[PDB]
Design a protein around this ligand. Structure first.
Ligand code: FES
Ligand SMILES: [Mg+2]
Ligand SMILES: [Mg+2]
Lengths: 25, 98, 220, 111, 133, 232
């Protein structure tokens, strides 16, 4: 059956929250 | 014959995807003073406060616009093996459907 | 009385679907009634896992193919019990549907208990009603959980009193002690209305079938 | 405890005594009423006791005897009322009726 | 009367054993119906267990191919200003029409995710559906 | 007749259970006292009932008067009956090793005429159930209530030959030394027969008990074992 669900990582996963200084020296 | 898998795949609720910040249409089915109980097609209804603007227009059977925040409000608390549910959805009442 | 029994009480038991309960519902109808919508995975009960198709964005979905077979078995059992003039008691502590369930029970000539369940109604019935009281032959739970999200005491009491139980079990319910569990949504008004309609129709049709069979037997 | 046979007999004795009192007072037994019973008993058996219930009385046995016995199920065992197993079938039936009227209205000196 | 040990066996097994043992003179009204049409599972009491270690529930997450497209749509054009009508069994959102056009283009052309997205946007704008990025 | 001892309530018969409110008589049931204790005053009694044909149960009754406790325990016991499956209506279907709380009970199936060589409470409960041949050893804390609970649990959780045949889908064949190499099929599956045989496990990984092996090898020397006793 083509309508069966498929294994997959959550495509709606929101980007994980960042602190204001993340990526800065 | 249409299988349950096809029904779930092509269901509007499935198509909606995440329910956060989605505009939906609900229908008022019960009123308790200024508390409006609205069904929008989900498992649970949402309880909204009667707006101070054109509040008289909000009656049973009225179609309203809602911004869904959560389909069911649950939260696991300290020392609990299972989540505690209020059996209600979370939504914001925007207005009446013209 | 041997011919009476063999022709009326044993005849229905030789047919797979004697009361034709299969045409009362379909997977399409259950989907339209939102019977497939369960609770979130955080409230999931372990014993409800085999009945769950999957989780859609942390929301459990009840496999309606299994629900169809379970509902078929439960409705067949209910129809057969009503044909035998057994006492049928509906139980539900969801106050949103107490009026509907009481109306349905009155309509089909059966009994309802949507109020606070006192200690000993089933296990102490003789002291609470009288020494010659007759207990229900079948108990149907439209909601198997009480208002603190724990099992209705009537489930364990009926198990103690050897009374078969039919039950609507949501994803957060325990189906271990319900004789004929029916996985489905117990919150949405559409699903509850569908359950009430199906059970009322089955009971009424079973009683009418019994009456007409008795009339035919008397005529012949 | 008063058996139903006992109350039946007392009804019989009250009826025969009613006709007897009607004969004694010369009134027509056919139209003789309870007020007539009270007045005739007061006349024949005068009593100025202040307590009205301590004075002579010949009332219909139904009013005197507090015997009550209501059957809630038939010989087959099926209860008559659909709310029997609640244990308060009358109260919950009344509440159900009131709630139904409230639903209908929602769709639409004394103590 | 039957045994009140609800945690031992099931009501059917207890009733059957007591009937055969002679404790119960007559079978209950439901025994024959149960025997003719048994449930799928025998109703036996079991204590639910908390899982530990690597034991996990076998419940899978429900995902479809189009979900990816939906995500990107909901990330690029955002949530449609048009409201969802979940009561209609055949409601078509802007995202759903975008998905259908995307799949038709994929089946009638090549497989380049960005190109499919952009050309699908061009096609929807050509049809006359507003799409504000 | 005295119980286990002259001044002991244990083992004394209380007569048949009273006719229940349900309308059922229990003239074929016998009641035996298993324990009497003073609760500090009231009396707590543990009693067991059984008809001798597989139906048996036990209950606790608490009351200020001892006779009231007896009556309560008996009447509650008759409404919490177990059914115990018996192999040929004289013994158990297989050896049963159980531990309830801190009380260990090892029971062994035995041939006909072996008798009841078991704890006295176990002897009484077996007589109530109808078991005539069995061996039993109790270890750990000898607590009467725990002993009764473990005994009933283990006896109710025994698998019959028919159940094993249905589970494995194979003939369960009994071999008796007195009957030579004759194969006696005691159970056959109700469904179809599996055609592939059980794996011939060269050395099964079973958990053996040191007492049984020591007895089999003759290193057990106890002066208290295998002593001559009255028929039980
Ligand atoms: S959140 Fe990434 S460095 Fe702080
Ligand atoms: Mg629920
Ligand atoms: Mg002595």
């Amino acid at each position: 059956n083509e309508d069966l669900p498929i294994s997959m990582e959550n495509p709606y996963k929101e980007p994980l929250k960042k602190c204001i200084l993340c990526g800065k020296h | 014959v249409e299988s349950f898998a096809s029904m779930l795949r092509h269901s509007p609720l499935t198509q909606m995807g995440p329910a956060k910040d989605k505009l939906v249409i609900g229908r008022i089915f019960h009123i308790v003073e200024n508390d409006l109980y609205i069904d929008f097609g989900g498992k649970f209804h949402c309880v909204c406060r009667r707006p101070e603007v054109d509040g008289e227009k909000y009656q049973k059977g009225t179609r309203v616009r809602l911004r869904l925040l959560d389909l069911e409000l649950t939260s696991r608390f300290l020392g609990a093996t299972t989540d505690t549910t209020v059996l209600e959805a979370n939504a914001v009442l925007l207005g009446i459907q013209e | 009385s041997t011919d009476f029994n063999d022709k009326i009480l044993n005849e229905p038991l030789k047919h797979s679907d004697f009361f034709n309960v299969k045409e009362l519902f379909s997977v399409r109808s259950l989907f339209d009634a939102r019977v497939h919508l369960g609770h979130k995975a955080g409230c999931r009960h372990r014993f409800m896992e085999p009945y769950i198709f999957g989780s859609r964005l942390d929301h459990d979905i009840i496999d309606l193919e299994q629900t169809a077979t379970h509902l078929q078995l439960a409705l067949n059992f209910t129809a057969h019990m009503a044909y035998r003039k057994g006492i049928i008691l509906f139980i539900s502590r969801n106050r949103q549907f107490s009026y509907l369930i009481e109306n349905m029970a009155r309509d089909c000539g059966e009994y309802a208990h949507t109020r606070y369940f006192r200690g000993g109604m089933l296990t102490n019935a003789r002291l609470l009603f009288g020494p010659t009281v007759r207990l229900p032959d079948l108990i149907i739970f439209l909601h198997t959980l009480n208002n603190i999200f724990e099992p209705h005491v009537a489930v364990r009491d009926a198990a103690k009193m050897n009374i078969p139980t039919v039950g609507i079990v949501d994803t957060n319910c325990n189906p271990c002690l319900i004789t004929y569990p029916v996985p489905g949504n117990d919150d949405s008004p559409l699903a509850v209305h569908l359950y009430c309609r199906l059970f009322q129709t089955a009971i009424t049709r079973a009683k009418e079938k019994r009456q007409q069979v008795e009339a035919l037997y008397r005529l012949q | 405890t008063y058996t139903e046979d006992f109350i039946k007999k007392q009804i019989e004795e009250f009826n025969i005594g009613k006709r007897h009192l009607a004969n004694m007072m010369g009134e027509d037994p056919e139209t003789f009423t309870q007020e007539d019973i009270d007045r005739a008993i007061a006349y024949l058996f005068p009593s100025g006791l202040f307590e009205k219930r301590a004075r002579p009385v010949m009332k219909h046995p139904e009013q005197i005897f507090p015997r009550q016995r209501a059957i809630q199920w038939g010989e087959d065992g099926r209860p008559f009322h659909y709310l029997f197993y609640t244990g308060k079938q009358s109260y919950y039936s009344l509440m159900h009726d009131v709630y139904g009227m409230l639903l209908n209205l929602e769709k639409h000196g004394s103590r | 009367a039957g045994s009140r040990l609800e945690t031992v066996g099931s009501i059917f097994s207890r009733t059957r054993d007591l009937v055969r043992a002679g404790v119960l003179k007559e079978k209950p009204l439901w025994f024959d119906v149960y025997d003719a049409f048994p449930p799928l599972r025998e109703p036996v009491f079991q204590r639910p267990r908390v899982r530990y270690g690597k034991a996990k529930a076998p419940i899978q997450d429900i995902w479809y191919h189009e979900d990816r497209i939906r995500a990107k749509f909901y990330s690029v054009y955002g949530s449609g200003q048009r409201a969802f009508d979940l009561f209609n069994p055949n409601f078509k959102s802007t995202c759903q029409r975008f998905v259908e056009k995307y799949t038709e283009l994929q089946k009638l052309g090549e497989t380049d995710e960005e190109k499919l997205f952009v050309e699908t946007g061009k096609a929807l704008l050509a049809e006359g559906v507003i799409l504000r990025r | 007749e005295r119980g286990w001892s002259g001044n002991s309530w244990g083992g004394i018969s209380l007569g048949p259970p009273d006719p229940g409110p349900c309308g059922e008589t229990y003239e074929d049931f016998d009641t035996r006292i298993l324990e009497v204790r003073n609760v500090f005053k009231s009396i707590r009694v543990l009693v067991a009932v059984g008809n001798g044909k597989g139906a048996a149960g036990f209950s606790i009754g608490k009351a200020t008067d001892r006779m009231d406790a007896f009556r309560k325990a008996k009447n509650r016991a008759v409404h919490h009956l177990h059914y115990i499956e018996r192999y040929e209506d004289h013994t158990i279907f297989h050896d049963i090793s159980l531990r309830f709380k801190r009380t260990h009970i090892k029971m062994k199936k035995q041939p006909k005429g072996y008798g009841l060589r078991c704890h006295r409470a176990i002897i009484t409960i077996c007589r109530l159930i109808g078991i005539k041949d069995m061996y039993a050893k109790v270890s750990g804390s000898i607590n009467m209530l725990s002993l009764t609970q473990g005994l009933f649990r283990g006896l109710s959780r025994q698998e019959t030959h028919q159940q094993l045949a249905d589970k494995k889908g194979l003939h369960v064949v009994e071999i008796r030394e007195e009957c030579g190499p004759l194969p006696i099929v005691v159970a056959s599956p109700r469904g179809p027969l599996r055609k592939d045989p059980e794996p011939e496990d060269e050395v099964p990984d079973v958990k053996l008990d040191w007492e049984d092996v020591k007895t089999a090898q003759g290193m057990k020397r106890s002066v208290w074992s295998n002593l001559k006793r009255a028929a039980t």
